[PDB]
Amino acid sequence: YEEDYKLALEAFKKVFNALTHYGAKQAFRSRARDLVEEIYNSGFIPTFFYIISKAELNSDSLDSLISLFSSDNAILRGSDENVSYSAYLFIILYYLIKRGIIEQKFLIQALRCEKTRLDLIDKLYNLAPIISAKIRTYLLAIKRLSEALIEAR
Amino acid sequence: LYEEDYKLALEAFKKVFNALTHYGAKQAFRSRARDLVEEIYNSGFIPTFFYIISKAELNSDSLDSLISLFSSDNAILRGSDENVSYSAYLFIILYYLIKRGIIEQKFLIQALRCEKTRLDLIDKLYNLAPIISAKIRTYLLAIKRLSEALIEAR
Amino acid sequence: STQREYVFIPITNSITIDVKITIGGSDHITNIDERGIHNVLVITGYAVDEKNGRLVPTLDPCDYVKGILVAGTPQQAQSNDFLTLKLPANKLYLIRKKGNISDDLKIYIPYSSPDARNSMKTKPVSISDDTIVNNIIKEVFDKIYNITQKEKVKIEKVKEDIKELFSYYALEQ
Amino acid sequence: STQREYVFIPITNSITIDVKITIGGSDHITNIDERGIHNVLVITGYAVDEKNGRLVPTLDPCDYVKGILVAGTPQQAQSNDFLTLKLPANKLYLIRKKGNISDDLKIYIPYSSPDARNSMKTKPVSISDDTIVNNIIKEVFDKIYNITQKEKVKIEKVKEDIKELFSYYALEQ
Amino acid sequence: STQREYVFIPITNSITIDVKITIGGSDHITNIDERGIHNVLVITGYAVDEKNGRLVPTLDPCDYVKGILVAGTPQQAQSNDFLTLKLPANKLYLIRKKGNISDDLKIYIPYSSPDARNSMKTKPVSISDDTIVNNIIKEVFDKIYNITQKEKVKIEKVKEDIKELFSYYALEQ
Amino acid sequence: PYYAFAEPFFIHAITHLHVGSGSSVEEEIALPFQRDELGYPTIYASSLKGAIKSFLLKEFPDKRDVIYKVLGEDENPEEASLGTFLDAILFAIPSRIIEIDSAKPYVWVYVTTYELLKKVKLYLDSISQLSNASFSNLKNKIDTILAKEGKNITLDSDLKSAILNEDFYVELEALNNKIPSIINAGVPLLVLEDSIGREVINRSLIRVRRIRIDRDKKVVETGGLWSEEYVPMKTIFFSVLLGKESKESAIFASCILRNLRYVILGGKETIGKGIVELRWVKDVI
Amino acid sequence: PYYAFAEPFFIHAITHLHVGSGSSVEEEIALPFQRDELGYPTIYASSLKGAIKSFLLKEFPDKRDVIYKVLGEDENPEEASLGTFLDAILFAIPSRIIEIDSAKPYVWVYVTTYELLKKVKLYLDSISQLSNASFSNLKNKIDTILAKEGKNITLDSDLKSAILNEDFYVELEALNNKIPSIINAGVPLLVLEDSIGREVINRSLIRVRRIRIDRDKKVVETGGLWSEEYVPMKTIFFSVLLGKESKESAIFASCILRNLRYVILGGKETIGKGIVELRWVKDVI
Amino acid sequence: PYYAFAEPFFIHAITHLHVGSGSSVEEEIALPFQRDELGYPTIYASSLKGAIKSFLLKEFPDKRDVIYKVLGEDENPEEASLGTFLDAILFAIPSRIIEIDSAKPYVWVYVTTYELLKKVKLYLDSISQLSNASFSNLKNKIDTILAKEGKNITLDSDLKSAILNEDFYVELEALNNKIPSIINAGVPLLVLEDSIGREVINRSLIRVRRIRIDRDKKVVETGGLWSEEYVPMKTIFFSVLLGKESKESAIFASCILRNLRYVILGGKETIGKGIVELRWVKDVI
């Protein structure tokens, strides 16, 4: 019985609403269709570095994220590319908060302070072989949802 | 007992048959009828439903075609035979769910009309996936046989 | 009522006699079982004030103080300066959270007014210079935990756990 | 070793004083737990002697005595009539078996000479007249068994089972 | 080479003074390590003569005797009633079978002529009356597997496997 | 009276079970089970008596006289028997289950319908007036259950919904009382409406295709193909052993039946079918 | 006793195996494996008997009569057989594991559920009553396990937690760490609950699309496409071989079964399925 | 002996190899390699048998009757086939290496695990008992390797440390510089503990995205994009070819398998995948 499709539905509700411009939606759809195969081939840690490097984790975008974890009325603002990459980062972190892989207080307390995003990535590193196995179906679900509910350019 | 499901299969098949207008669409739907029930009962109903919707390309045009088809029987599904066949199969499933009282026709028809509600429709499906998988098997097998019998091999 | 008291882990020995109670209740949230120190509560936003060490109220999320949790109410020379507070047992930033709690708890905090006549320009400080590790082990880590040196032979673990687990932020003042 | 004795269970109020000790050791089989008596023993080919109920050896396989076997000894004033004999705890004939027994056991039987002057026509007797069942629990299963009224509160069923599950055969003579 | 001597394991004490070579050579085919007894020998078509226990040969394949294979030679008081034979170690009936053997041994066995003057009606015999095992452990394994009482505090294990392991067939005259 | 006492008992299939009936070709098996009159499996009283007779004559070879008295003779078919079995009534067949947001997650449940319970109550009520057979908790539970007829009922008040044998969705409701576990398994019992219960039960029976193979070239022989139904493991049938007054009957019931736990029933013993545990309803429930 | 010998034994799949129960009316494309009465795989003892018998008729051609006696004649059987097989109960299936962080990590594990142990317990309890055999060691270990029937446990390991068949996260619990092994292998054994075990065990099976290619042009022929369930290597079943005394049964138990190590069960033998090793619990435990 | 001849062999991939495993919805590779029961690649003996059978049928067209006898008929099977392929266990996959603690700089190396070796040993142990052939040489090599279980082990080198497939670091130990390399190659063989061996083996596989371009304009087709999975060239699988006593089996083992070296395993042959070399253990070790 498959609750990763359920968790995927919740995360997709959140991000689909948190993107105003339609181009941001479509960019997210492309990230969804691509980064799952990437995370399968290359692995989790390389792909994570890729995403977070194309996400523009300032204290503004990270604020929009930290609120998105609870808001239902938050908004991801920025360029289509930055916001698509941050939305996928939220997808991943949202999986990690549920499924108890990362303590939510730790994830928040690290997203706030820059001196702890490195420790976030260090924990992510220690756990990578677990995450890379668990998150596969979650990400395939997000892929299917994206290519269903969003259109193409 | 599920003897009703052969009447249901016949009428739903008549629908999605006289909807798909080009014959390539018909043969594509035939391939769908064959392989998708196998996938449903090997992998699960929810994975296969996600797979279907992802390949059906639910836009406004396709979804009004589906709704009118629920009602009219004069509708015609257009648009890239692979997608039109995956949407024909989506309609087969939704038609069972409606005509057998699992999803309410009102809730569903609403959900195909608006976007906040497609997600809630998918969530509602997920919550009844055991029941749908259990009850839809005879219907789907009948549809698969009907396609094999009435649509010419490609 | 279940009620604990949090004692932070700075590098100063200004923590000697600041309580009137050692054990208080029945369980110490902070556990030490063959893996080091556990359930260690992290309290953010507050920097340490080694000059009469107390948690100053800072607004920056990067600043924080770490320490352990034990039961009781300290030294009965208080109730004007401390942050007492009643928490629902899961709002605590514990690390390596071992077990669950009873849906609520009420703990205490060495609290301070900010004395806004000097800029609190904090600085992080870690626990090195093992002499302090040893004198706090003999000082605080046994006066409340005599379990150590009775059963635990791997004191070195909870020894080396002092260096690795406790960063915090001094006001520099 | 294991010494145990079999108490007879008729309605007549002669069963009260038939023993010295109840417990003796830690080994008991005729237990009772929320459902009723377990390992009720049944002696066939014998008969109750309701006028001071004891066991006369008939030859009839339609005759029996349903009683219970508990550690102890008879009155310390017997072994002239009492049949003492030891069985390997598997050649018993018991009902409502909760658990096995230790493959070895000596047994006291309240016996009597056949008294060859009376024509042993026998009579099948149940236990009824709930006033009679009450005190015969009171002086037997409330006296020998004390675990009544601490875990057995619905005593009505511990009377009820005794009503039908404890039948026997008498002399009517 | 490596001789082998067969210790029948009956209830009787006919194993009194029968082995000369305690160890002598290299090992015993029968072993005792953490899984009880290993590599037990079973001779079929043979009953026992528990009165001076020596395997009488019947022909019925349903008669068997299970014993152990020590590395010994009999008492220098034999070669007349004992059997002995050299056979390639894979004809042997072994249970609890663990490892390979020397592919060829000289097995000596307590043997006895049939005494054709009273028809042998053999009967199965299991080993109960746990004092029987309690003294046979000391009567054979104490002298051979002194490893027992030296390694296995679970004499209960090497006891229960004995009880549920060594059955055999007795002449019953 | 001339039926002095009755001992009800259950019959738990330990292995699968095949008590066979007239092979034919209309029901597309080749070798079915023994249907009663409503299509439920049942063990005829003749099969019960014969199988138990054979088992006892093999086991207790001395009481051959007592067994031949109570259960009857075969070389002297002159004196009748002092004991009889009733046709074993199917009580509870085991069914697979998929829970639907229910507290305790089970993977199989017992299933009954209301005809099965009507027949069980018929047996019990009929034998109740013997002054030796009371067990009024049993027929109490049976009757409180039969009161709730017409609804898929569950004797464990947590399921509320299920899928039985991966095909049938039943929405349950609890008996508004605890009604302690009739059968001492830690598994819930489900009493279903009759129409759906027959579907669920017919699909709970095992149907096997079997073949005969040539030992030489490992290929099926011609005409060597058939099929047969087994009753699953864990299945419970119910019957009663009725006895008359004599003293062979007493000695029978006193030592033959105290030691009769497992018995071999039906056919295909070489295939393993037919082992059964007899539970005497005088200690349990 | 009803049986002269009772020989419980394990069945270690050396290669994948496909026992039959051919295509159904719904899955007309699949060749499923033989199913239990609660959905797990099993080997119906008719297949066990046919396979072992066909093997023994050739490995021991001088004892064809000891075999015909115990395992039944096949030319003109004037009597019944003296040996029985009970159906093979799945004992422990292997599953791929992703151990989070513990002692030197494993890449697979033995997965058994509680309901399967209950069936094994029924077998061991029944045959210890119908025969002079007592398996008190196995029964003891299995009841020590069954005491913990409400949780996932682990045997001869700790693991504390794991991800079995890359889909199911289970949190385990070491039993007592004094309990010796059952199957004297090295890899641990997780006794999962039944709801989660059903799913892990369905994941351990092997569905396989197979095709039939035209030789002269290397394309799939029209129709040649089907599926097949297998049971992985290393899988352990559990059955019993039982016999009545006849002096052929003594020889059988003492000559045949002492020289019975590998056999071939099931079908698809040409493609390497079916090789199996019997383990005779009498000398594993 | 159950088997006339028993011929283990090694499959060396000359080119990359793709034996397809069928596609599912939750699959993440359109065309995945056939997987083992514990994750590694294998070749289902269905594919081996079909491959080799087609090859033989076209290369030895005079010996058609011998092929059809030992490998079954195509037109009308009135009997089984005397020949049997066991599923090919992955023996050793090649992996990139970066040396530390070593002397000779290698660019790649052979990698195998203890679980693959235990499966090979099971194959050997069973095939020795089921036939007149013992494989004492291979058996002793594998057993003296398996003695060193848990510890990562190099066979013929002195590496003492390495980085495999760019990411995984292993501190090796030299087993013995007198054990003849089972692999006929001159490159070393590392036998790895499995927790790391499976990661290395997963990263050795070759994934490749292909596209389909419209044949009227050099731009892709809608939907024409997929991924594929190959095992690298120089991979070794271990299998066995088994035959039941016959006259055609003697001819098969006599001058078919002595004239059988190169075959085409699997699919993607137009892309030049699946050229394979068989190397019989009877002469390779």
Residue of D nearest to F256 (CA): D93
3-state SS assignment for residue G127: helix
Which residue among F96, F270, F272 sits closest to G87, beta carbon to beta carbon?
A: F272
What is the distance between the alpha carbons of residues D87 and D104, in angstroms, rounded to a whole number? 6
Contact between residue D20 and residue D108 where contact means Cβ atoms under 8 Å apart: no
Give the distance from residue A124's alpha carbon to the nearest chain B alpha carbon, in angstroms. 28
Cα G133 from chain centroid?
A: 21
Q: CB-CB: which of G26, G29, G207 is closest to B137?
A: G26
DSSP per residue, A39-64: HHHT-HHHHHHHHHHSS---TTHHHH
Residues 6+ apart with CB under 8 A from C121: C171, C172
> Shortest CA distance to F238 belongs to which of F17, F16, F115, F87?
F87
Per the CB < 8 A criterion, the answer to whether D72 and D20 are in contact is: yes
Do residues A87 and A18 lie in contact, with contact meaning Cβ atoms separated by under 8 Å? yes
Helix, strand, coil % (nearest 5) of chain H? Answer: 25, 30, 40
**C-alpha distances in angstroms, F130 versus A17, D47, D170, F120, H87?**
75, 22, 20, 17, 68
Q: What does the buried/exposed string (b/e) look like for A79-101 if buried means 16 or more CB atoms within 10 Å of the residue's CB? A: ebbbbbbbbbbbbbbbbbbbbeb
Which residue in H28, H199, H227 is closest to A136 by CB distance? H28
Q: Evaluate whether C52 touches C110 at the Cβ level (below 8 Å).
A: no
Interchain contact, A113 vs C93, CB within 8 Å: no
Q: How far does CA C169 lie from the centroid of its chain?
A: 13
**Inter-chain touch D61–F132, beta carbons under 8 Å:** no
Interfacial A residues in 47-106 facing G (CB < 8 Å): none
For residues C77-110, one letter each, b for 16 or more C-beta atoms within 10 angstroms of the residue's C-beta and e for the rest, the string is: ebeeebbeeeeeeeebbbeebeeebeeebebbbb
At residue E142, what is the residue type? D
Helix ranges (DSSP H) in chain B: 4-19, 23-43, 45-56, 60-71, 81-99, 105-111, 116-127, 129-135, 137-150
Cβ <8 Å between B47 and H26: yes
Residues of E in contact with G283 (CB under 8 A): 95-97
CA atoms within 13 A on the CB side of G149: 15
Give how far A123 is from chain B: nearest CA, Å.
31
Long-range contacts of range C47-50, CB-CB < 8 Å, 24 or more positions apart?
C47/C120, C47/C122, C47/C168, C47/C169, C47/C170, C47/C171, C48/C8, C48/C10, C48/C125, C48/C168, C48/C169, C48/C170, C48/C171, C49/C112, C49/C170, C49/C171, C50/C10, C50/C11, C50/C12, C50/C14, C50/C170, C50/C171
Neighbours of chain E (3+ CB pairs under 8 A): G
Closest-CA residue of D relative to F252 is: D61
Contact between G200 and G165 under an 8 Å Cβ cutoff? The reply is: yes
The residue type of F199 is E
The residue type of B138 is T
**Cβ-contact E163, E130 below 8 angstroms:** yes
Nearest CA in chain H to B51: H25
CA atoms within 13 A on the CB side of C52: 7
DSSP 8-state symbol, D35 = S
Amino acid making up residue F138: L
Which residue in G11, G86, G85, G10 sits closest to G281, CA to CA?
G10
Q: Specify burial of residue H108 (Cβ count, 10 A radius: 0-12, 13-18, 19+).
A: middle
User: F198 at the B interface (CB within 8 A)?
Assistant: no
Q: What are the structure tokens assigned to G215, written together? A: 């030789």
Q: Do G283 and E95 touch (CB under 8 A)?
A: yes
Among A93, A37, A99, A36, residue whose Cα is nearest residue A64 = A93
Q: Please, which residues have CB within 8 angstroms of residue F231's CB and are 6 or more apart in sequence? A: F13, F16, F17, F18, F19, F33, F41, F93, F205, F206
Distance in Å, alpha carbon of B37 to nearest chain G alpha carbon: 10
Cα A72 to Cα A19, A24, G71: the distances in Å are 11, 17, 72
CA pair distance A86, A65, nearest whole angstrom: 8
- CA atoms within a 13 Å half-sphere pointing along the CA-CB vector of H219: 2
- Interaxial angle between packed helices B45-56 and A4-17, expressed in degrees from 0 to 180 and rounded to the nearest 10: 30
Q: Among all residues of chain D, which has the CA nearest to that of F282? A: D96
- According to the entry, how was the structure determined? cryo-EM
Q: Does A136 touch chain H (CB under 8 A)?
A: yes
Q: Give how far H91 is from chain A: nearest CA, Å.
A: 23
Relative to beta strand G189-191, strand G108-112 is parallel
Which residues lie below 8 Å from residue H114, measured CB to CB, with a gap of 6+? H146, H149, H150, H191, H192, H193, H194, H197
| Chain G contact present for A133, CB below 8 A | yes
Interchain proximity B1–F199, CB inside 8 Å: yes
Say whether F67 sits in a helix, a strand or coil: helix
Planar angle of CA C142, C144, C145, nearest 5 degrees: 55
Tell me whether residue B149 is exposed, middle or buried, using C-beta atoms within 10 angstroms of its C-beta: 0 to 12, 13 to 18, 19 or more.
exposed
**d(CA G168, nearest CA chain A) in Å:** 9
Report the residue from G99, G204, G270 with minimal CB separation from H81.
Answer: G270
Q: How far is G60 from chain E (nearest CA, A)?
A: 15
For residue G34, the 8-state DSSP code is P
CB atoms within 10 A of CB G205: 18
Which CATH number goes with the domain that contains A55? 1.10.520.30
Residue D65's identity, in one-letter code, is: V
Q: Do F269 and G198 touch (CB under 8 A)?
A: no
Residue F89's nearest CA partner among F279, F240, F264 is F240
- Asked if residues B1 and F199 have their Cβ atoms less than 8 Å apart, the reply is yes
Rounded distance between C-alpha atoms, residue B83 and residue A151, angstroms: 13
Q: How far is H259 from chain F (nearest CA, A)?
A: 28
Between strands G262-264 and F275-280, the pairing is unpaired
Tell me how close the Cα of F96 comes to any Cα of chain G, in angstroms. 6
Query: What amino acid occupies position H137?
Result: N
Interface test with B, best of F169, F199, F202 (most B CBs within 10 A): F169
Phi, psi angles (nearest 5°) of residue G277 = -125, 125
**Minimum CA–CA partner of H205 in chain A:** A41
Exposure class string for H40-69: b at 16+ Cβ within 10 A, else e: bbbbbbbbbbbbbbbbbbeeeeebeebbbb
Residue identified by tokens 């002499």 is: C131
Number of domains comprising chain D = 1
The answer to whether residue A75 neighbours chain B at the CB level (below 8 Å) is no
Check contact H-A (3+ Cβ pairs < 8 Å): yes
* DSSP strand pairing (G220-230 vs G30-31): parallel
Is A1 in contact with G199 (Cβ distance < 8 A)? yes
Which residues neighbour B90 within 8 Å (Cβ) at sequence distance 6 or greater? B52, B53, B56, B58, B66
Q: Which residue has the tokens 């464990």?
A: F156
Structural domains counted in chain A: 1
Q: Kindly report the backbone phi and psi dihedral angles of residue A34, in degrees, each rounded to the nearest multiple of 5, phi listed first.
A: -100, -45
Chain A contacts in chain C segment 79-98 (CB below 8 A): 93, 95, 97
Q: Are strands E83-87 and E105-109 parallel, antiparallel or unpaired?
A: antiparallel
**Rounded CA separation F7/F281 (Å):** 7
Please name the residues in contact with G41: beta carbons below 8 A apart, sequence gap of 6 or more: G19, G33, G34, G35, G90, G93, G201, G205, G231
Q: Catalogue the E-assigned strands of H121-218.
A: 153-154, 162-164, 168-170, 189-192, 206-213
Contact yes or no for G166 and A133 at CB 8 A: yes
Residues 6+ apart with CB under 8 A from G17: G230, G231, G235, G265, G266, G273, G274, G275, G276
Which residues are registered as beta bridge partners of D47? D56
Residues 6+ away with beta carbon under 8 Å from H258: none
Separation CA F88–CA F11 (nearest Å): 8
Q: In chain G, what residues touch B41 (CB-CB under 8 Å)?
A: 27
Measure the CA angle with vertex F50, ends F46 and F55; round to 5°: 150
Which whole-number Å values give the CA distances from F235 to F29, F38, F49, F265, G91, in the listed order? 21, 18, 19, 13, 21
Work out the angle at residue H32's Cα, subtended by the Cα atoms of residues H30 and H33, and round it to the nearest 5 degrees. Answer: 160
- In this complex, do A37 and H227 lie within 8 Å of one another by their Cβ atoms? yes
The Cα–Cα gap between G128 and B21 comes to 70
How many A×H Cβ pairs under 8 Å? 11
Q: How many Cα atoms are found within 13 Å in the side-chain-facing hemisphere of C47? A: 22
Neighbouring CB atoms inside 10 A of G179's CB total: 15
Give dist(CA B53, CA B62) in Å, integer. Answer: 12
Q: Domain limits at C97?
A: 1-173
Angle between helix B137-150 and B81-99 (nearest 10): 140
B149 close to F (CB below 8 A): no
Q: Is A140 on the interface with H (CB under 8 A)?
A: yes
Please provide the size of chain H in residues: 285
Taking the C-alpha atoms of residue H120 and residue H11, their distance in angstroms, rounded to an integer, is: 14
Backbone φ, ψ for residue F251 (5° rounding): -70, -35
Best of A101, A106, A113 to substitute, by most chain C Cβ atoms within 10 angstroms, is: A113
Q: How far apart are CA A117 and CA G226, in angstroms?
A: 52
Query: Which of G20, G83, G123 lies closest to F270 in CB terms?
Result: G83
| Alpha-carbon dihedral angle through residues E155, E158, E163, E165, given to the nearest 10 degrees | 180
Asked if G136's CB is within 8 angstroms of E164's CB, the reply is: yes
Chain B to chain G, count of Cβ pairs less than 8 Å apart?
5
* Min Cα–Cα distance to chain B from H25, Å: 7
Query: How near does any CA of chain C get to the CA of A52, in Å?
Result: 20
C-alpha span between F176 and F162 (Å, rounded): 18
B106 three-state secondary structure: helix
Q: CB under 8 Å to E114, separation ≥6 — which residues? A: E56, E57, E58, E120
The residue count for chain F? 285
Q: What is the rounded CA–CA span in Å between residue G91 and residue G285?
A: 15
φ and ψ of H139, to 5 deg: -60, -45
Which amino acid would we find at residue C64?
A: Y
Contact predicate B122/A9, CB 8 Å: yes
- Could you give the CA distance from residue F3 to residue F241 in angstroms, rounded to a whole number? 10
Long-range contacts of G217-224 (CB under 8 A, 24+ apart): G218/H54, G218/H269
**β-strands F162-164, F189-192: how paired?**
unpaired
What gap in Å lies between CA G24 and CA G30, rounded to an integer? 8
Contact, D141 vs D15, CB < 8 A? no
Residue A22 tokens read as: 């339609």
* Count of C-beta atoms within a 10 Å radius of residue F252: 23
**Could you identify the residue written with the tokens 């010796």?**
G180
**From CA F240, how far away is CA F248, in angstroms rounded?**
18
Beta strands G189-191; E31-32: pairing state: unpaired
The number of residues in chain E equals 173
Q: How far apart are CA H204 and CA E142, in angstroms?
A: 59
